[PDB]
Amino acid sequence: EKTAVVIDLGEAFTKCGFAGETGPRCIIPSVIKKAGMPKPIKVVQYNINTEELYSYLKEFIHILYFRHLLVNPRDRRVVVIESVLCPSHFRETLTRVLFKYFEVPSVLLAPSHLMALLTLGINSAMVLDCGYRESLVLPIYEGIPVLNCWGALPLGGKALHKELETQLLEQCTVDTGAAKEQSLPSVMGSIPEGVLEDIKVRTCFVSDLTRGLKIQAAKFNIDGNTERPSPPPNVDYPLDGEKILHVLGSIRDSVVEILFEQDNEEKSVATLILDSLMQCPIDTRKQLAENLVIIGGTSMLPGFLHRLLAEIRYLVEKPKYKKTLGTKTFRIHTPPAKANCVAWLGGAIFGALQDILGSRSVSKEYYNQTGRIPDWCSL
Amino acid sequence: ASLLQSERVLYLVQGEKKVRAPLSQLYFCRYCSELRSLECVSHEVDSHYCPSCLENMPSAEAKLKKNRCANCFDCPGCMHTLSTRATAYYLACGFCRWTSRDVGMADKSVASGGWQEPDHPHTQRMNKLIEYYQQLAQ
Amino acid sequence: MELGELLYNKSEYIETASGNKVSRQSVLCGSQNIVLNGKTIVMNDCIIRGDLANVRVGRHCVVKSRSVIRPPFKKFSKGVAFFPLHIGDHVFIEEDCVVNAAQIGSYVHVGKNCVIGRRCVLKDCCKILDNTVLPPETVVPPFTVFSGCPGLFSGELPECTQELMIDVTKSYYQKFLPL
Amino acid sequence: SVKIAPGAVVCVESEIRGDVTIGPRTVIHPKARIIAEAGPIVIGEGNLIEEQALIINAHPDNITPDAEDSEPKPMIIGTNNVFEVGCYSQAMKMGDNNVIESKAYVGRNVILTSGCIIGACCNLNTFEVIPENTVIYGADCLRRVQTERPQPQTLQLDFLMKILPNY
Ligand SMILES: Nc1ncnc2c1ncn2[C@@H]1O[C@H](COP(=O)(O)OP(=O)(O)O)[C@@H](O)[C@H]1O
Ligand SMILES: [Zn+2]
Ligand SMILES: [Zn+2]
Numbered sequence: 001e002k003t004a005v006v007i008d009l010g011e012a013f014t015k016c017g018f019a020g021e022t023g024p025r026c027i028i029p030s031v032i033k034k035a036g037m038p039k040p041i042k043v044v045q046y047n048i049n050t051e052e053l054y055s056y057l058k059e060f061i062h063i064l065y066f067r068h069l070l071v072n073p074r075d076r077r078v079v080v081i082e083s084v085l086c087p088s089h090f091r092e093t094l095t096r097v098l099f100k101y102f103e104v105p106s107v108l109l110a111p112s113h114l115m116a117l118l119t120l121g122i123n124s125a126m127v128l129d130c131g132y133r134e135s136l137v138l139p140i141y142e143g144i145p146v147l148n149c150w151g152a153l154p155l156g157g158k159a160l161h162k163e164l165e166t167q168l169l170e171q172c173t174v175d176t177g178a179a180k181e182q183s184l185p186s187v188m189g190s191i192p193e194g195v196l197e198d199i200k201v202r203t204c205f206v207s208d209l210t211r212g213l214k215i216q217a218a219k220f221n222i223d224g225n226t227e228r229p230s231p232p233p234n235v236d237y238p239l240d241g242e243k244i245l246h247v248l249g250s251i252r253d254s255v256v257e258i259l260f261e262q263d264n265e266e267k268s269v270a271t272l273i274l275d276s277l278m279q280c281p282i283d284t285r286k287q288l289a290e291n292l293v294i295i296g297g298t299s300m301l302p303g304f305l306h307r308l309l310a311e312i313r314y315l316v317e318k319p320k321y322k323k324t325l326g327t328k329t330f331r332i333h334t335p336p337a338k339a340n341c342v343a344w345l346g347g348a349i350f351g352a353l354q355d356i357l358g359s360r361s362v363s364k365e366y367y368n369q370t371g372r373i374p375d376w377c378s379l
Numbered sequence: 380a381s382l383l384q385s386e387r388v389l390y391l392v393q394g395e396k397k398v399r400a401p402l403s404q405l406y407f408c409r410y411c412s413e414l415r416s417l418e419c420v421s422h423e424v425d426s427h428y429c430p431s432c433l434e435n436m437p438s439a440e441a442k443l444k445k446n447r448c449a450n451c452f453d454c455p456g457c458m459h460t461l462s463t464r465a466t467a468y469y470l471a472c473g474f475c476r477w478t479s480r481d482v483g484m485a486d487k488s489v490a491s492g493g494w495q496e497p498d499h500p501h502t503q504r505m506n507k508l509i510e511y512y513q514q515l516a517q
Numbered sequence: 518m519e520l521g522e523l524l525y526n527k528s529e530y531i532e533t534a535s536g537n538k539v540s541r542q543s544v545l546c547g548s549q550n551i552v553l554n555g556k557t558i559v560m561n562d563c564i565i566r567g568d569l570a571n572v573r574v575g576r577h578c579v580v581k582s583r584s585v586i587r588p589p590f591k592k593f594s595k596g597v598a599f600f601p602l603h604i605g606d607h608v609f610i611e612e613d614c615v616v617n618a619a620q621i622g623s624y625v626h627v628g629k630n631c632v633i634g635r636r637c638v639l640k641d642c643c644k645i646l647d648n649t650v651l652p653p654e655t656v657v658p659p660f661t662v663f664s665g666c667p668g669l670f671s672g673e674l675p676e677c678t679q680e681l682m683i684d685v686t687k688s689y690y691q692k693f694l695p696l
Numbered sequence: 697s698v699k700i701a702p703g704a705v706v707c708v709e710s711e712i713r714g715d716v717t718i719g720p721r722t723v724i725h726p727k728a729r730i731i732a733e734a735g736p737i738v739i740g741e742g743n744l745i746e747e748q749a750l751i752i753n754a755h756p757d758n759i760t761p762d763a764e765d766s767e768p769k770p771m772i773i774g775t776n777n778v779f780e781v782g783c784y785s786q787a788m789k790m791g792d793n794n795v796i797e798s799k800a801y802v803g804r805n806v807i808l809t810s811g812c813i814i815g816a817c818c819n820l821n822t823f824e825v826i827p828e829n830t831v832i833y834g835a836d837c838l839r840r841v842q843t844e845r846p847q848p849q850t851l852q853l854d855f856l857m858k859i860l861p862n863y
Contacts, residue, residue, distance in 0.1 A: 003442075020509060022499035022501060022502050022505055023499065025445060035386070046461055058418075062422070066424075069446070070424060070427055070441060072423060072424050072787050073404050074421075103421070118508075118512070119508070121511070140506065156388075170409075170476060175822075177822030179822060206415040238837055238838055238839075240819065240836070240837065241818075241819075241820075241835065241836065241837055241838055242820070335502060335506065336501035349505075349508055349509060349512060350512075352512070352513070353512055353513060354510050355516050355517060358514040369452045376391070380626075380644070380674065380675050380678065380681055380682075380685075381626065381644065382626060382685055383518075383520050383521070383522060383611065383685060384518060384519055384520065387519045387520065387677075388519060388520060401675075402615070403675040403677055403681060404675050404676075405677070424798070428658070430658050430661075430670065431655075431656050432656075432657065433656065443662070449580060456841065457667050457833060457839075458667050458669050459652050459655065459667055459669065459833075460655060460656070462653075462654050463669075470683065471653035472652070473634055473635075473653035473655070473835040474650070474652035474653075474666075474833055474834075475744060475831065475839075475841060476666060476669070476831040476833075476841065476843045476847075477841060478844055480844050481844055514667060517647055520822050532793065532854050544726070544727065546709065546863065547863055562725060564747065566725075566726070567863060568859055568863075573822050585747055585748075585781055585782075587746075587747065590852055590853075590855070592851070597852060597855050598855070599859070605732055609779075615747075615781045615782055615798050615799060617781065617798070630799070630817075632781070632797075632817050633800045634816070648817070648835075648837075650816045650817045652762045652816075664835055665836075666815070666816075666817065666818075666833070666834040666835050668836070
């Protein structure tokens with residue numbers, strides 16, 4: 001047998017490499033540069049025609065299997081990591097591309113949350129997945145994902161990128177280099193997603209709960225006269241060479257707060273753990289609480305894990321969660337690989353198990369016969 | 380190919396999937412009678428090579444070395460093939476003036492043999508988990 | 518334009534000798550060391566300096582206007598000297614292009630206003646796109662396209678370059694006639 | 697109006713205009729475009745110029761304000777300075793030990809220091825003094841990086857003394 005390849009198709013970035021390795025070999029933006037198109041189209045797009053999606057995935061998988069990885073597709077197996085409740089037609093297409101065009105031996109559709117649990121070694125743990133599109137949580141108890149007690153909110157990368165763009169356009173101060181030393185607002189109508197992502201990573205950080213709670217009430221201005229903490233210094237960011245955008249200190253520590261803002265509904269990234277944990281079985285409560293896992297690149301943002309764990313323990317004392325989750329000890333697990341590449345590492349650890357892989361995985365001979373991929377929906 | 384606009388007049392392929400492609404890109408199949416596209420045809424892997432120091436490596440050596448050249452290096456700041464400069468050797472880029480001295484990597488007495496990448500921090504924990512799951516899978 | 522190469526009428530003033538046509542406008546300071554064996558074209562306002570050179574060009578070589586081919590200086594501890602470059606067979610240097618390259622391979626299409634760096638080797642059957650910077654001491658493999666300010670692998674060329682490029686350079690030469 | 701200096705291997709075939717002031721050990725390559733429109737072109741020793749290099753002192757043509765009384769704006773250039781292929785330059789004051797790359801458009805009022813390099817095919821029209829020993833790379837973005845040590849180019853210049861004769 002040969003070392004099975006692991007792929008993990010995401011909206012922002014795709015993880016690729018081989019099984020039984022310390023981390024992924026290639027990690028790249030999930031896009032393709034088609035002739036005529038100035039900006040490259042995104043390879044994973046939900047709610048489009050199958051033929052157009054088929055062509056994009058055919059183009060992308062080709063780049064992964066030749067330019068990034070150097071190996072024959074037909075020779076060795078595949079371990080496709082994809083999140084639970086991934087759209088039906090997308091997963092059906094992705095398999096149909098691998099089985100028909102590339103003619104792979106067998107694909108294994110592992111849920112990202114159960115794979116993240118294997119990397120630690122613990123059999124039972126709560127898993128939060130703060131991705132690009134949606135920040136999803138799914139309790140895993142001793143190998144069994146509990147779909148009953150699922151939770152998701154659109155407070156990921158996309159929702160954060162959009163919030164940054166909005167704030168920058170309000171307090172817009174750019175030095176074009178054409179008598180634009182004076183503050184010039186909205187010279188460009190929209191900012192490209194590639195720039196916004198680079199600003200987010202380098203400039204913006206996650207504030208402490210004490211400082212963050214003041215920032216929330218400050219921008220609200222709820223019958224108070226200038227009750228904001230002192231912001232960090234303003235950082236100057238180059239746009240397309242000559243144009244120098246002066247990023248305000250307030251924007252850096254306020255953009256993140258949309259994730260941890262209550263917004264009346266009581267629906268934050270913090271609340272989603274406690275909302276799910278309260279809905280879980282009464283016996284499983286204390287085991288899941290003690291074993292928390294925080295995967296996804298959105299949680300890589302500096303000082304996110306401290307704010308989350310703090311915001312949890314504050315929301316615990318709130319009267320809604322005070323009865324059930326009152327006297328619970330919330331402890332976070334530190335996975336071996338980085339927060340972005342926890343999902344991938346599980347699939348590699350699973351891919352190294354050649355004996356179990358072949359049995360669980362769906363063979364091409366079965367797919368060609370039936371034409372029915374197994375899912376958590378009815379058969 | 381590009382100077383003359385070959386991407387204008389296109390030839391059609393017969394089969395399941397119909398595609399409009401330039402004749403320059405397409406291939407004729409002699410075994411039968413039907414020209415087929417770069418898309419339609421199946422791709423294989425023959426040989427691996429480094430784009431800087433053109434050295435044909437075997438398939439077995441690539442798997443051990445993780446599809447990389449030992450001698451050649453690419454700069455991290457910008458994506459370009461580095462060059463060894465002496466004073467006793469330091470690695471420097473031509474496009475950007477990023478040096479190996481900047482990050483604080485010590486100069487090596489031997490040219491190529493001395494340079495190395497540090498071992499992965501969670502490599503020991505990795506093998507222990509594989510062997511546990513391997514026994515459990517068995 | 519749609520596969521077919523278009524007409525270009527040259528003026529009376531041009532040095533036509535043994536097939537090799539060289540525009541009188543284009544200075545080539547150092548005529549001794551530079552050598553043009555084949556039926557080469559050098560368009561107006563182009564430079565081929567003899568700064569300790571040995572500039573050998575192809576059978577059907579083409580260099581469009583405002584474009585420079587200068588040899589690079591090798592920073593050697595023994596002796597600092599200008600390395601003699603060798604332009605390959607059927608080479609097409611595009612308009613306003615800068616070339617400080619040592620050993621340019623045969624059957625290559627160098628793009629418009631693209632700066633090739635010092636001591637840069639180009640292997641046969643490659644293509645550099647327009648508005649691109651190849652840094653000093655870089656190599657580009659066959660059937661490749663290098664682009665961007667970094668100057669890195671963009672993709673692969675069509676399989677039939679060796680056969681196709683012959684038609685291009687020979688057609689341009691044949692189509693390029695006096696008015 | 698020419699102040700030719702001995703030791704400097706300025707080639708006669710290169711084009712020169714206006715009230716020039718030539719340096720001690722400068723080496724000008726052929727088809728190097730130097731003009732002294734308003735004020736003089738002051739050249740430091742070892743300031744070699746290679747291929748196309750548009751060095752003009754035409755601030756009266758650029759703006760034409762009819763201000764600053766006389767406004768000579770004398771073009772001061774430093775020592776050991778490499779002007780590469782196709783690089784446009786117009787700097788009233790320019791420091792020593794700086795190497796602009798090929799096809800580099802330098803601004804109308806940009807002051808260069810030591811150990812500083814402009815990116816190849818990169819244009820900078822905006823007026824802004826360059827920090828001490830920092831390099832710019834790429835046209836799409838500037839992406840400024842501070843160098844460890846300044847780079848000298850003396851050996852190159854010294855060898856041209858031997859070549860230029862009989863050319
Ligand atoms: N190392 C990092 N540091 C900070 N932010 C990151 C990092 N890596 C990714 N991100 C951000 O977090 C997001 C993570 O998305 P990712 O988990 O890769 O995608 P998906 O959820 O589709 O699998 C990216 O879109 C990016 O904005
Ligand atoms: Zn190599
Ligand atoms: Zn670099």
